[PDB]
Amino acid sequence: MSKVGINGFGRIGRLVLRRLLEVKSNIDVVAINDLTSPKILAYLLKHDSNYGPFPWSVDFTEDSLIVDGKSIAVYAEKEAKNIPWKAKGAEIIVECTGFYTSAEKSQAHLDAGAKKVLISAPAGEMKTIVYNVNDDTLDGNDTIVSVASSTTNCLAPMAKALHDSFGIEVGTMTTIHAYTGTQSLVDGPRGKDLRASRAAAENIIPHTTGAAKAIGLVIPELSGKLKGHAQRVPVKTGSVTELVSILGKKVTAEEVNNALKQATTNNESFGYTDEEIVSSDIIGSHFGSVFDATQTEITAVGDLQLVKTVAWYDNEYGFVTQLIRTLEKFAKL
Amino acid sequence: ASMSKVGINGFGRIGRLVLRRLLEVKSNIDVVAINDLTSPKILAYLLKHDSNYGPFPWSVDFTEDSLIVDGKSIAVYAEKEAKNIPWKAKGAEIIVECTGFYTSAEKSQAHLDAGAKKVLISAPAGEMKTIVYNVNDDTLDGNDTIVSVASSTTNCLAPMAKALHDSFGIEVGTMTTIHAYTGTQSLVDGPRGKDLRASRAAAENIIPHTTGAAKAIGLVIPELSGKLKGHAQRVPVKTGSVTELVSILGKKVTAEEVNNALKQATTNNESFGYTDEEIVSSDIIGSHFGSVFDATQTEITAVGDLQLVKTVAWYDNEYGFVTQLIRTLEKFAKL
Amino acid sequence: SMSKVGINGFGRIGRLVLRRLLEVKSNIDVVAINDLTSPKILAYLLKHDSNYGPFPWSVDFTEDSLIVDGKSIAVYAEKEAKNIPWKAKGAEIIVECTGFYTSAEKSQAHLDAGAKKVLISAPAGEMKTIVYNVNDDTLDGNDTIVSVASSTTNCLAPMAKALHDSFGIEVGTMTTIHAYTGTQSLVDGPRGKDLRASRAAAENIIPHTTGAAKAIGLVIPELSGKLKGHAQRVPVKTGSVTELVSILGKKVTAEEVNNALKQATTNNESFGYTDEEIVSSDIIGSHFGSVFDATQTEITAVGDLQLVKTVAWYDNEYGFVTQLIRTLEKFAKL
Amino acid sequence: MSKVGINGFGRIGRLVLRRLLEVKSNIDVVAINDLTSPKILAYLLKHDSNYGPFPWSVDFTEDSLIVDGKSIAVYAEKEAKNIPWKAKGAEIIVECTGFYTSAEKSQAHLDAGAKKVLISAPAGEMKTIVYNVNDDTLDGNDTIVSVASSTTNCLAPMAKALHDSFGIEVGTMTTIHAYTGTQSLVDGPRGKDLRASRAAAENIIPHTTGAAKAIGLVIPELSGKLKGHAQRVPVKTGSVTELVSILGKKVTAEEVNNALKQATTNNESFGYTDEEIVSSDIIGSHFGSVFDATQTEITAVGDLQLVKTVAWYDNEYGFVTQLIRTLEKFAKL
Ligand SMILES: NC(=O)c1ccc[n+]([C@@H]2O[C@H](COP(=O)([O-])OP(=O)(O)OC[C@H]3O[C@@H](n4cnc5c(N)ncnc54)[C@H](O)[C@@H]3O)[C@@H](O)[C@H]2O)c1
Ligand SMILES: NC(=O)c1ccc[n+]([C@@H]2O[C@H](COP(=O)([O-])OP(=O)(O)OC[C@H]3O[C@@H](n4cnc5c(N)ncnc54)[C@H](O)[C@@H]3O)[C@@H](O)[C@H]2O)c1
Ligand SMILES: NC(=O)c1ccc[n+]([C@@H]2O[C@H](COP(=O)([O-])OP(=O)(O)OC[C@H]3O[C@@H](n4cnc5c(N)ncnc54)[C@H](O)[C@@H]3O)[C@@H](O)[C@H]2O)c1
Ligand SMILES: NC(=O)c1ccc[n+]([C@@H]2O[C@H](COP(=O)([O-])OP(=O)(O)OC[C@H]3O[C@@H](n4cnc5c(N)ncnc54)[C@H](O)[C@@H]3O)[C@@H](O)[C@H]2O)c1
Ligand SMILES: [Cl-]
Ligand SMILES: [Cl-]
Ligand SMILES: [Cl-]
Ligand SMILES: [Cl-]
Ligand SMILES: [Cl-]
Ligand SMILES: [Cl-]
């Protein structure tokens, strides 16, 4: 299985192609569905506000892109059940619209002639994969799978490390998170989420995220043990996740840091830093998550101990590297 | 006292500030109905909490079908097609059309078919009477039913062009506005209609953008038809904009002479202000003028008998423009 | 009453101190300002504010003064506090807003220069430190140099106090998502010894040390040593939010925590309550030191192990200034 | 000459080193003078908010940087006359502090034992070079030269092409310009300039530039014929210069754009675009100026004609590519 279609050629959809080209994948993107013209999709692929010029040639015709000399069909079907995936034989759909985040909704792609769907987002109780945490759970009979959120890909490897080394008894997460297209440019209606209606680049905006709540899909032993939320802030990409835990063991900072470093050794998904980085330094990262030893904090009074651990993530490109790792493995089962 | 009943179509950046300003000046206009695409709950939230102008100055509550503002009920509708808005239910006769989707005489006709009497469009709307208050509001009369107040940029450019034309003659000119980003632009890089540049992250770029302000200035100042062009550079400020005009004038001038002429034009002028202070864009946020001429930026470049004159005016493209809209509304309502 | 004030450092805080004093028609008169610049530049900065808009009163200047709402304010430019000629106009209480005199040892220079008392707008070591309506009762007539701690302290303390009083705080850690300030950098470049502080403040999320939690014991003695925390500086111009994750001395529900907080904010000029879905720009211009936000309360529990997250907004500029002024007024009458 | 010293390892200073390494120059930076430690300089070189991680290894010792395995001395001398340029034999100083922008001030480097100085800014009445406009004016007797400002490097090539093809009779420019370190993060004193006191990331701020005023040093024929100024705005780097001119004959937009296309042909200093780019697309440009045919505008009323031409520039890196070009030539004379 080598032929892919992308539904939603947005921030994530376009970076999916960029990354596949970058790693010289044997996956072949044959079709793209969105809501617009090839002309506009070509413009957006070529010029990127966060990552700069597309490294390959880009042209278009009235119904296709031509990327690095290869033709990619472009469709504009707002209902996935109408996407003509069989025309170019798209077998695996990378589902990056935000409108099909359940097994029932993504079933449309299979009805439309595809064989498998990989959803770029949480999608309820289905196989949900953070690469290098639970990718071994992908199965030859899986047809619809989720890679959860960027935040999940940031939290999970840190949570796995901690839990494996020390035990996590309970914990709460706050991500300080780059603004995304689900937010608003100027104050205006944005469905039922009132906070989402507020000007994103001019505000700190509290936001609900399921990353902690649904972590049991990725690390079953942590089911129900974590909660958390996001503060959306005015940076264009690059985010940071803080986790405050009660661990099963008394620890030093050096001990937590040492365990995290071991977990990141030879781990292409999970990086380590002890440099005093800031968010722009994570832009373009090829990890899902980069644990930051410099922010580790142990607060102890008598017998009680809280442990704060912190990890960076490029919620666009870093997350995409994870999605592609998952896609490559998925495509072979 | 004329008590005209008003309806607002599009309770957006402009539509919400229209209400704010009407209450602020204690207008005799009664806003009796609002049409948008959402619930009273959401509109109440947006009216109360404003990222640019802070807490609404009056109480705001909602019911299942209304806003209650300072104790007065305003019916809320959600008809995406204007012909279906029940403007007759609360007697809304003048519609302040602020959706961006009815910017022509043919499209705003739907408000009249739905039972309103008059429409004031908060944007350019092609070949119709187009009013910059204190420039050409004298051209209004009792027979007008659908009128435009043009763009924020027009409201900035027109008083400055008028003053220059009246004092010196403008022979030809070009404008560039360095302009706050607005809701027509994009939060993240993504399709935004057919304008390629408008697809790009607005808070992260300088983005060239076309504006008709200079091209259609002739609707406002007929003598300058076809003598002006220009465009915008959209930049990452949330509101507050500035318009530069480079002109060949009908006579040789000094900067002092230009500045004095502009000062005279702003004296006892509620619409057009003047400054010789070294202000920046956040200083214009909340302006009660459609335009403020900035004498500190005046520049004369002269070689032999050739002269280029650069004149610069700030504007709050949100609230400042709204003050112009309301002045035109209060006049248009009484005719 | 002491009634004559000098401001040292007519900066974000110093200018807003004057604004607030005139807004509340205090009987305190500002008779002198010291900074490093000209009256022209101070008048320009006072008239024009990027965060709060035009100054609400008339502003003019001479070669050695400001004239504000028709009242003359002397302007000095002495970089060393000991040299400031405070006695010329009888400045009694110095509001110290430069950031350069954050200790009793440093700020006593003002006294050498002829002042009677100093109120420092920042943490200043282990001196008496006041969060209004948390421990301002500890002030007395013998206090000569006093601190009002940081904006973050003023946000954190009334929340911690309410929780501690109702339920007990056994241990906790704070993270404040905090507007950038003048201590940061516009473009990437050296900013003393702190590496992170060198980075472009409007283009990054920047981890940053704060003493608010560490030194909370100056303000709430029973929590001495029980809290730690830090900041993430982010690109908003003012308006900040503080999260505290606590182990409490009692099993609780979110409603119970929210009700206790609501009670503590009733008839409390310093400490507000909200259950509206606000964002940071809605706190800009707040007249509170701290606004507890019920919408963000979260209780995470497995058996007897319970974490409690509580969240309060604060306008680190003006809201903090309202606290500084409340303290100042009281300080002036002891 | 192949040994360079950098004074002011700032935005421009650090990028100078980056660009020298990128083009594999035979110039070697042997010393750097600034106001801080090697540790802080190394941190700053390594992690860049605008251009991302440094492409070569960077380490530090107590007295130096190690960059790509080579040692560069670090000094911290506030006054240029005390800088030990002779210790490592620094021959040409790239003067990037902003405090020595005159022949008389930059003499202190020669007094301290350097042989030449290239100033990264306008520096009064001395030879002022925009590469591929007037670098032919340099000779072997020059010892202190200027490469003018970012805006000068943007303006000059566009003015040269217009004036050569059509004649410029008079003109005024406005650059819509990224904020720089001369501005203020929060409202507060910043020298005598009132507008420079105001928070740069939250305002449009009118600001002087002498690029047009002193354009005569670069294009003597245009001396006294141009004025202009800037509007500093909240983007981190990437700028755009508009020039409104009265030309020496009647033109069409196509005529202007073809003349500009021809001037940019085989021109390493000066680029052309007819794509609908925005400021983030110029970040990391290897040109001093990129003329933009999409924004050309002719306003004609009988005999009277205004011509508006627009060119992008990366005021950091793009400018630095011009600085290095001039540097490489200056080193050989
Ligand atoms: N941006 C992030 O940080 C991030 C990170 C991880 C996951 N995700 C997830 O990926 C998905 C996409 O996010 P994004 O940031 O790329 O969003 P985006 O808005 O940039 O892109 C969505 C794309 O889908 C297209 N689209 C919308 N509705 C459609 C439909 N019915 N049919 C076809 N195309 C349609 C749009 O035109 C757009 O090009 C979401 O589920 C999101 O939660 C986003
Ligand atoms: N700077 C400014 O923002 C500014 C200045 C002057 C004029 N204008 C003009 O005013 C108009 C509104 O601009 P804005 O910035 O308030 O835009 P906006 O997007 O903030 O508001 C538009 C509002 O209209 C609603 N809407 C959209 N389609 C609708 C429909 N069919 N029926 C009912 N409601 C609908 C939206 O839900 C939203 O509340 C545009 O014509 C614009 O050009 C804007
Ligand atoms: N900005 C905030 O959010 C905030 C909140 C609470 C407390 N604080 C504290 O208040 C103090 C001031 O902060 P700010 O944000 O107003 O800083 P700022 O940089 O805006 O103001 C500093 C002022 O002091 C002047 N100054 C510097 N050194 C001086 C000296 N030796 N003598 C006289 N004047 C001098 C400067 O010129 C400037 O006007 C600091 O201690 C800071 O921690 C700041
Ligand atoms: N930033 C731009 O866009 C740009 C473009 C073209 C030219 N320039 C010019 O280049 C020069 C540098 O600008 P920049 O943006 O890199 O400024 P910067 O502020 O980023 O760097 C200045 C550097 O010099 C150091 N410094 C200050 N005084 C010093 C001294 N006396 N001795 C040694 N080091 C000292 C600082 O610590 C800092 O590292 C200026 O003259 C500027 O006009 C800047
Ligand atoms: Cl949760
Ligand atoms: Cl989130
Ligand atoms: Cl035009
Ligand atoms: Cl701490
Ligand atoms: Cl802080
Ligand atoms: Cl000039």
Author numbering:
A (entry chain P), D (entry chain R): 1 to 333
B (entry chain Q): -1 to 333
C (entry chain O): 0 to 333
Question: Could you share sentences copied from the article?
Answer:
Glyceraldehyde-3-phosphate dehydrogenase (GAPDH) is a highly conserved enzyme involved in the ubiquitous process of glycolysis and presents a loop (residues 208–215 of Escherichia coli GAPDH) in two alternative conformations (I and II). In the presence of inorganic phosphate (Pi), GAPDH catalyzes the conversion of D-glyceraldehyde-3-phosphate (G3P) to 1,3-diphosphoglycerate (BPG), accompanying the reduction of NAD+ to NADH.
These results indicate that C150 and H177 are essential for EcGAPDH1 activity.
